[PDB]
């Protein structure tokens, strides 16, 4: 059963929802994001010092 | 030193296993073929058999021999008595432990066979053996000459690279030739220097680990 939703990009806060199939019992879905990284593609050119 | 590389297979023994297509019917065979891997190019397969190669019946090194099991008793022949074929005859290169390196043409089965004084042993398994050419001119026997290309063949020497197969304790093999009938009781004669165990349900539940 294809179910699409949307979650805000904010850590710590639990995000709750359910899935209502039209003649069955509602299925609850919970997603709590903990740590959301962002890792760029990093390319060393040179180092320097004294 | 090659004995430091053969030292692993001193720890092990050959065994008998099930071959569904023997010399007459479906037997228990000394030369059961566990696998055939043929992923190199110019005709080189790699059998994993139930026998062992390069070792004599005690555990030392001999050059071109096959060490198989025969109802418990571990026997040997030279390697040039063993032949195999797929559709044409193959050509054995060498062996090391449970494995063998042949030079086989393409076909749809492997039949290893050897011959004793009168008993002919065989094992056929329906495993496809495939032949892979290099490049963009499809041959079936590699040519006399041309140019050279980067291929991948199975190596001709045993050498410790990062790929392992897994050993285990053997189970108990029931052997009939031990139990015999006396006048009124059941006589069990375990082999010399070797324990056994007998389980019966002639009276009640029974278990006894007898030693010689």
């Amino acid at each position: 059963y294809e179910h699409a939703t949307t979650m805000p990009s904010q850590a710590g806060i639990s995000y709750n929802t359910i899935v209502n199939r039209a003649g069955y019992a509602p299925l609850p879905i919970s997603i709590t994001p903990t740590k959301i990284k962002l890792i760029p593609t990093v390319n060393l050119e040179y180092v320097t010092c004294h | 030193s090659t004995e430091e590389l053969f030292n692993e297979y001193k720890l092990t023994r050959p065994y008998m296993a099930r071959c569904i297509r023997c010399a007459v019917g479906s037997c228990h065979s000394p030369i059961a073929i566990e696998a055939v891997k043929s992923d190199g190019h110019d005709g080189y397969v790699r059998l994993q058999t139930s026998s062992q190669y390069g070792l004599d019946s005690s555990g030392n090194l001999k050059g071109r021999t096959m060490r198989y099991d025969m109802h418990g008793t571990i026997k040997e022949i030279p390697l040039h008595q063993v032949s195999l074929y797929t559709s044409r005859p193959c050509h054995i290169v060498d062996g090391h432990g449970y494995f063998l390196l042949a030079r086989c043409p393409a076909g749809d089965s492997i039949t290893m066979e050897f011959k004793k004084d009168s008993v002919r042993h065989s094992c056929s398994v329906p495993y496809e053996v495939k032949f892979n050419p290099v490049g963009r001119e499809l041959y079936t026997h590699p040519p006399e000459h041309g140019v050279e290309q980067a291929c991948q063949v199975y190596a001709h020497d045993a050498q410790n690279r990062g790929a392992y197969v897994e050993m285990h304790l053997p189970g108990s093999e029931v052997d009939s030739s031990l139990v015999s009938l006396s006048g009124s009781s059941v006589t069990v004669t375990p082999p010399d220097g070797t324990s056994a165990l007998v389980e019966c349900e002639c009276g009640g539940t029974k278990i006894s680990e007898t030693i010689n």
């Binding site: 059963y1 199939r21 039209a22 003649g23 069955y24 | -």
Partner: protein, 49 residues
Amino acid sequence: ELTEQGSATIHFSTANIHPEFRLQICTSYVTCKGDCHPPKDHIVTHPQY
């Protein structure tokens, strides 16, 4: 089986998206009214009831 003041539960099968039928029970007719919903499977492995 009927008790004195209990409630009897039956199972039925339908094709109706708004089924409504008179249920005869041994003398009398009671009206059963509801709204059915599509099932979850497309292809099943038993014929139609």
